[PDB]
């Protein structure tokens, strides 16, 4: 109790923070959540890992809260902000143990944070669009493999890096933007992998409905349908008792020859072209292909609802009334420029090319092994999430190690100005931005001490920009320690990652420290 | 709670434990494990899976061994002992020493660039072998039956899964990978003659398929594919009313005889006499079928319904309506009962859809059945993977020597600090060849050393040694084969395991 | 609002008052003298404890 109970508060929190100091990324290590004592989950990332794991202590529980709202946010930061807010323990603790008053260093933790978003505000690249973030070419590089997509990862990053920044794309109808609903990439082997193009309009993954098909029309009305064709039976379209062999037969007869005209309706009210995203039988698939219709099946989910919107107006996909062969009751014209149908990836495939009410663009990508797609499954999700940040807000922060460190000296610049009591306050909030370069040599496996000296030596005035490295601060890698060039392979993060953090960080740096108690009274 | 140091010791103990007496099995020669119970009993295990599951381990890291070996069993079968001995020598002889100056990470990236090392080495090392070839295949199954101790029955069960695993062979996915065996299937039946082993066409079914009425011989007739909706509808297709009165019993009935009507008429029209139903049968409705006059099975399990629907190879319909000779039944299904006993069996004969086969085997009991069918079990392992990959790798520690010194080789010419860790993937590989030095009984200094030595010389193309011999030995003369496909696969495991072991640097709870 | 329409004059917070009384009250205690001397000059000796823990809470050395 007293004192006492804070210190073991102090260092509950440090324990918890040392398991995401060491796993943080894709590059990150590991952890054993023992669920009960039997039962195990292992993965990596910092916060998720929180919330999988039993928290007992308060100092733990406020934290997994922490990385918790930090998240809702941004799905960015939430491994960081925990590690930043711990450390601010640390470092008050032996204060308190001094002579100075916590309440003392937790206000000038307030004004150093203040001070800390005002340099986030005259350090930006706001162009971001011809270079990227986190460099253009390294973004989708690494969360590759090294050496099976490591050979063909110049070239695949060009591909994808450059679509996720700036090409044409559907939003929510009518409303043009970049696409922060991603972008329509599928991975399928074929061909070479040093072939793969853009292609104008989506990529679909769907099985040929050809015997008689055709597979060119120019303009066409989309039926995207979240229900499976088929047909069913239905009973009887005369009577309602069967009591001679000769009306069950004709009324089964009749069932074939009504679907058929039932089609150039579907025709007249808007179709061309059916997308069906389960099957379509043989049965069923002969009436739709002699009227003069393109229906293809098993269309992969993903693609077929991501068409529907583009293709607008009203669609059903947002609906889904309908049984069988039934003529359209036009909810159901979604709207398109043209369709062909080409050979690609060694395999016919449809391209729906653009949509008239909202263009699109979709890369489909070539392998040559199943092992190689799976592999740009990942470099894919890595470079999305990147580039998703930058279209959302265009002023971004260069440096991720490298402006915390900038930002070390630029608080203690600040704090031998002010003066007093508050000058040593300052101090160690600028000791705990060093634990972020720190964490990121955890993860790589390099020195710490010397990596975050090395950074500071490069400087003239703080300001962190890629016109100087070996002069000032700029980038880091995840694998070394050496500072990089934004036209290079250095890390970048977004204003809004970084100045939640540090402020979020602040709050639960104040809670914790607080207590005086914990038992009972 | 564990942290740092205690957690990389207990790695590597845990792994070793297991290890120990699991590394002897391996090859004809075994050692076997005793378990004992608190009831004072024995059971006697040379089969690794059977070790690992039975005994109480306490600690996280010792249950991601078991669940490794369980990943092992799913692919192949064999190998399984392999696995967490490989796992746990990468570990011992590269961690603590690196750990100290500390790099955990690299030790992790070094263990892949080795693995991709060993698999460029295989396909030198290795020949070709003819995938059509009986004779040529059949050695190498001889090789792999007698780990299990049985050599008796083995004999037979070769080639009964040589012709089994090529019959259900016809996967396409563009590249035409070959990982079906899915389509195969043992029929056990008790009783007979001890030596009638052969093989039959689609796939036969008895595990709930044993009915006194299947109509005796059917050398035409279709099977027709249902997961229908052949029962009665209070309605229309959908029940909306309710019998609770007199009234809507008398009106309810009228509808339920039309809608079975109509469905058997859609099954009829494409010609059975033998028709399946997996649900949706009813007993009025089964009762319809034979005033359809046609022989109904029903009340089979999802399972064996999936297994008849591969047997004529002809996709299943849940549609009610308009089955045709199109749709369902696509070729010819037939369907012979034999009483073998007097129990009925059925087979289910001829795919369309590229072939498919199964397999009888007739034991003169239970027990005698018993021990063919594991070791037909082991052989068409064999069977598939020489399919797969069409090269076969020579066994014992030959293989693993050549990649000794390959990594030897590359860790002095790239000069990283990756060069140690490369080193203790290097002597990690030596266990295959100390476990079948053990196996001998000779001393691991002088066959050792004689087999880095071949290395100079010959270049371990093939001449390893072998634990039935004591003595370095052409593995090709002797008839020890394996197939380079279960080699590449347990090696690969085996990094996995080694990687995600060293990445738990705490366990916390 | 009840606190000052009960009580119509106005001092001020922030722990001014508590030292003012306090001072007042020991040299008062002092002239009139007596045994209860000692009870009020310590009792305004109280007093000082509050705005003290006060300022330390608000971050500076709080005896000074």
Redo the contacts between chains.
Sequence with gaps: TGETIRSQNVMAAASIANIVKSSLGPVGLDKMLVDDIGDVTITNDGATILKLLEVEHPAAKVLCELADLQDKEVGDGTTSVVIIAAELLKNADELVKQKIHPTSVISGYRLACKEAVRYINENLIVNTDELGRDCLINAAKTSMSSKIIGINGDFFANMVVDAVLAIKYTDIRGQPRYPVNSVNILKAHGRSQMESMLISGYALNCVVGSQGMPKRIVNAKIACLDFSLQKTKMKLGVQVVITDPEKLDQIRQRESDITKERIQKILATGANVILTTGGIDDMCLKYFVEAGAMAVRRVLKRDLKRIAKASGATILSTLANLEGEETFEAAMLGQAEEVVQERICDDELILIKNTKARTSASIILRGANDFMCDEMERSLHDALCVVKRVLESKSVVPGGGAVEAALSIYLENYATSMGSREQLAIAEFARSLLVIPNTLAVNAAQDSTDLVAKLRAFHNEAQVNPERKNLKWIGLDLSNGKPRDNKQAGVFEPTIVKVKSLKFATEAAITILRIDDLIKL | RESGRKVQSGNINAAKTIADIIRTCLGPKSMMKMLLDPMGGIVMTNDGNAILREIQVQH??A??MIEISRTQDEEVGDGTTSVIILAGEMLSVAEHFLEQQ?????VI?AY??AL?DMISTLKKISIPVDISDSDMMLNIINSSITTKAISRWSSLACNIALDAVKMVQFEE???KEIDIKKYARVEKIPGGIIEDSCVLRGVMINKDVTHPRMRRYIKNPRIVLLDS?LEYKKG??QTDIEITREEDFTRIL??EE??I???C??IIQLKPDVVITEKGISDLAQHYLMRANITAIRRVRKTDNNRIARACGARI?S????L?E??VGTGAGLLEIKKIGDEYFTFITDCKDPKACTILLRGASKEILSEVERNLQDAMQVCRNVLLDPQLVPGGGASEMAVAHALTEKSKAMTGVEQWPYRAVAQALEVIPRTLIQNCGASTIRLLTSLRAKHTQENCETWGVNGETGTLVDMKELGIWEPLAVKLQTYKTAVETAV?LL??????? | IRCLVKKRALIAGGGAPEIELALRLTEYSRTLSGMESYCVRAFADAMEVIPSTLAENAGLNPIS
């Design positions: 996280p890291a249950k991601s500390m790099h955990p990470t690299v990236s892949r660039k991709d996915n563009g590249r909706s229309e297709s009228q509808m039309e809608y009507q109509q469905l008429e859609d319909v549609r009610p309506e308009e045709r199109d749709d995600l990445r738990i640097d705490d366990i916390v709870s």
